[PDB]
Structure 1
Amino acid sequence: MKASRLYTLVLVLQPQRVLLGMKKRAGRWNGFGGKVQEGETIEDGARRELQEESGLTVDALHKVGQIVFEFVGEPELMDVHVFCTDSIQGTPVESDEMRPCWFQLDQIPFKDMWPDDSYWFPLLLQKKKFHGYFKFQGQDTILDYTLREVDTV
């Protein structure tokens, strides 16, 4: 089995809307996150990436899922720890690399999100926790995947 590198993904989910970020430099909407750094907990890495990438701070996050991504032709797996929060501080900030935008929860832009999000983000919305795995050929094609609702992440 390949080695895996730790990542975070943060969904700011309010009762009627979700905040996503568009990659500018591209075209795909995603939650906020990035690589976990040496010596920080995964949750602290998620908080740090949210602040670095969007400007938002949060006191805490709730872990809702974990998804492992495999890409054909790449040696490492991405082990993505997925967090949610409903409570924010500040306004999101656009950078050279990311543009944040709110979407109503009847306008989730699935066609412009990673394809896997169509499978797990419905579970997140139902207050469910999940473990997933997706194997991609390039950015658009899933060759294999597993998804399971779990009681504990």
Structure 2
Amino acid sequence: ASRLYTLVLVLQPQRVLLGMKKRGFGAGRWNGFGGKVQEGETIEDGARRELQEESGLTVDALHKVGQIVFEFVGEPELMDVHVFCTDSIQGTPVESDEMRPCWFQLDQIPFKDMWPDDSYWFPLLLQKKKFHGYFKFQGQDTILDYTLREVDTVLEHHHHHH
């Protein structure tokens, strides 16, 4: 019981491009660019699609930086979140109806305005370290427990429908 998602962090040496959810679920919070991997598309096509739709950006390559599992109390189904980062982007960031991209200096990242797990794994992302992580949530604002480990290589899940 799981659902497959992507999260894309556009990360340059001094800055990170985040985006502000403009409405709907998670409105008011800054996040990486991502969403549900649909049926008929691969994980990496889904990551590129969500980045294109949300930021208007194209990337030459995505690096696999980590894997996050979300569990929610009252929901039996886990979120399987494949996390990517990209150094090299093409195009000018422009908002959609869903998301507005903005650049943040790396020491200025607005963790109080982001999802609570971000404070945990973002330091590893910024140190250029790969990670596996798990967060048990109660509601949107509360983490009940977590496990986060640095990994040498991101484990491959072999999803054969994606």
Give the TM bin, normalised by the shorter chain: over 0.9
Quote how far apart the aligned CAs of 1:58 are.
Answer: 0.8
Alignment coverage as a number of residue pairs: 151
Answer whether contact 1:47 1:60 (CA < 8 A) is retained: no
Q: Distance in 2 between matches of 1:28 and 1:73?
A: 23
Q: Distance in 2 between matches of 1:17 and 1:97?
A: 22
Alignment correspondent of 1:9: 7
Alignment correspondent of 1:83: 84
Answer whether contact 2:54 2:100 (CA < 8 A) is retained: no
Identity value in percent: 100
Cα offsets for 1:127-149 (capped at 9, x unmatched): 10000000111111111111100
Output the TM-score relative to the length of structure 1. Answer: 0.95
Cα offsets for 1:38-88 (capped at 9, x unmatched): 232212211111111111011210000000001112231111000000111
Quote how far apart the aligned CAs of 1:93 are.
Answer: 1.2
Q: Residues 120-135 of structure 1: matches in 2 within 5 Å?
A: 120-135=121-136
Q: Distance in 1 between matches of 2:96 and 2:49?
A: 16
Output the TM-score relative to the length of structure 2. Answer: 0.90
Cα offsets for 1:16-55 (capped at 9, x unmatched): 0000011111111000011112232212211111111111
| SS across alignment from 2:35 | coil
Where do 5+ consecutive residues of structure 2 fail to align? 155-162
Q: Distance in 1 between matches of 2:94 and 2:19?
A: 10
Answer whether contact 2:16 2:103 (CA < 8 A) is retained: yes
Quote how far apart the aligned CAs of 1:9 are.
Answer: 0.1
Cα offsets for 1:86-125 (capped at 9, x unmatched): 1110111112221111000110111111111111010011
Q: Distance in 1 between matches of 2:117 and 2:42?
A: 25
1:149 partnered with 2:141? no
| SS across alignment from 1:133 | strand
Answer whether contact 1:20 1:100 (CA < 8 A) is retained: yes
Q: Distance in 1 between matches of 2:96 and 2:32?
A: 15
| SS across alignment from 1:152 | coil
Deviates more, 1:31-40 or 1:130-139: 31-40
| SS across alignment from 1:119 | helix
Q: Distance in 2 between matches of 1:78 and 1:152?
A: 21
